[PDB]
Design a protein around this ligand. Structure first.
Ligand SMILES: O=C(O)c1cccc(O)c1
Ligand SMILES: [Cl-]
Ligand SMILES: [Zn+2]
Ligand SMILES: [Zn+2]
Lengths: 313, 313
């Protein structure tokens, strides 16, 4: 059963966490062919460590690898350290640049630890942010798509107050989100997708009966996107459109509009794709699990699910 | 077998639609005891009509009834007429007032026809509205609870712009919604429920990192509600807490937060309860079906489901 149909970068995330271990356990389960399509970014010491523990030294031989986020000392499984924090960001940066340059077609990031990154003195507010800084983009120009249970929902705004999001919403910002998500849909195996744009207000403002925002923002944006020859319905009330379940891509205006349905239908296994330029980066949907790091009992399922997602045709 | 454990009003809705017929067909299936707990509001001519057609004249004898929304002419099954429109609103008003006065404990409305009501020169924007006008309350002092697929979600704000809702949100408004919903949960058969309060902002503001609103509004409200001895978790991010699926009552801050999950999980078989003062009003989940009125084609299932819901214990 082939699940990898294209070149991917895998940053092994925090080298003290379970990231290295799940990386090896996921790769272990693929064919030789599939494994050569995945290039692994991270400190080799960490991968050697996880090979001892999981007993997969044979696997290291055939791994395609680039040293990134090298360590100045032995690995300390379980420990939160600034060096591990830097390592994380360096690996992800190496991977992201490989995607930028075209060497790979998408990126997967194994789990980070935020405290670790913070103690390294690095500003980190999620992968959308990192992606922007590395690529030289405004954070506003990079979006998060959640994927889970058949649903794909790009969010035009994300981790800010509702008020702050409304102040920022514009025709252009929406257009940008759709363009980013459409490019991303090509990668996910849906070339020319059906798009539904959520209303900002209930019932998509109901004309102008429940606020003016939709006639100023979503409506103009949808008209501009149709004229450029995209199949776009909306704005329509998020509740009503979602329930029809007949679009390949929904476009949410606020974090909660897209996050509520996703976590309800796919409460464990939803993948979080940061999109910006040609670079699509997915986290695994779980933490660094410092408690069990080095103990060799971590599950690669979430990782494998993510590979399957970013690696279909 | 027994589904009616309490006194209820049933307004028969549009007397030209299927409302009268389903009223009779629902009552027909209950026991003598159950039938004496349901008082029917509406024109007697309409009930006589539907008795001829469905062949249930024997049933009219047993019925507890109050004439409301009398007609000036014979019933015209299938026809949209302003008289039928007025009749609808009068029956519902009679029913609501019987609930206000304490003669009954909750109210069910059989289907209306909006065009009919509009042509009578009456403003009708849903049952939340009507309930307010009749009881002498602002529309913001009536809350809407959606019920479907095990979820109960009262909304603190409803049919207004997101910004307008945030402007209006207060500790008191939330407390009010919960008090209304809790009283309503007693009626629904869940005396002492587990309550979850949604955050206004993503991740419930994340302390104050994503806006101040939750520390001003939801957090104080939850503390005040615990002090009065209610089991209340939150505020938590709506996405995360819903997915745990461990509470009898969720409290949404905005229309979409509560409407999205409900429509997704229960595209059919959901109930909309309007709560205000002691009055709990539910519609049946369907239209007046003018094309089949008088034709003996409609089932009472949706009506009976609603009776079962408002008549638990
Ligand atoms: O828009 C709503 O308030 C609503 C409430 C219940 C059912 C429905 O289809 C819509
Ligand atoms: Cl009675
Ligand atoms: Zn989030
Ligand atoms: Zn609505």
């Amino acid at each position: 059963m082939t699940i990898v149909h294209r070149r991917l970068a895998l940053a092994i995330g925090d080298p003290h966490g379970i990231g290295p271990e799940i990386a090896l356990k996921a790769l272990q389960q693929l064919s030789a062919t599939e494994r050569s399509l995945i290039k692994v970014y991270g400190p080799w010491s960490a991968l050697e460590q996880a090979a001892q523990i999981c007993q997969m030294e044979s696997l290291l031989q055939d791994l395609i690898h680039e040293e990134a986020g090298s360590l100045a000392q032995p690995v300390q499984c379980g420990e939160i350290t600034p060096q591990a924090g830097l390592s994380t960001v360096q690996s992800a940066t190496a991977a992201i640049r490989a995607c930028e340059s075209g060497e790979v077609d998408a990126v997967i990031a194994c789990p980070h630890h935020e405290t670790a990154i913070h103690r390294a003195g690095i500003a980190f507010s999620g992968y959308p942010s990192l992606l922007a800084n590395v690529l030289g983009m405004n954070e506003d120009e990079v979006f998060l798509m959640l994927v889970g249970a058949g649903l794909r929902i790009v969010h035009v705004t994300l981790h800010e107050s509702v008020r702050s999001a409304l102040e920022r919403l514009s025709p252009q910002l929406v257009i940008n989100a759709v363009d980013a998500a459409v490019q991303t849909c090509t990668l996910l195996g849906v070339p020319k997708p059906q798009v539904a744009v959520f209303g900002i207000n209930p019932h998509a403002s109901e004309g102008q009966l429940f606020g003016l925002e939709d006639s100023q923002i979503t409506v103009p944006a949808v008209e501009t996107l149709r004229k450029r020859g995209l199949t776009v319905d909306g704005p329509m009330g998020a509740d009503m459109v979602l329930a029809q379940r007949k679009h390949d891509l929904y476009v949410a205006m606020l974090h909660d509009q897209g996050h509520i349905p996703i976590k309800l239908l796919a409460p464990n296994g939803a993948s979080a794709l940061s999109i910006g330029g040609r670079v699509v980066l997915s986290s695994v949907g779980h933490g660094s699990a410092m408690d069990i790091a080095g103990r060799g009992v971590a599950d690669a399922t979430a990782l494998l699910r993510t590979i399957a997602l970013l690696g279909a045709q």
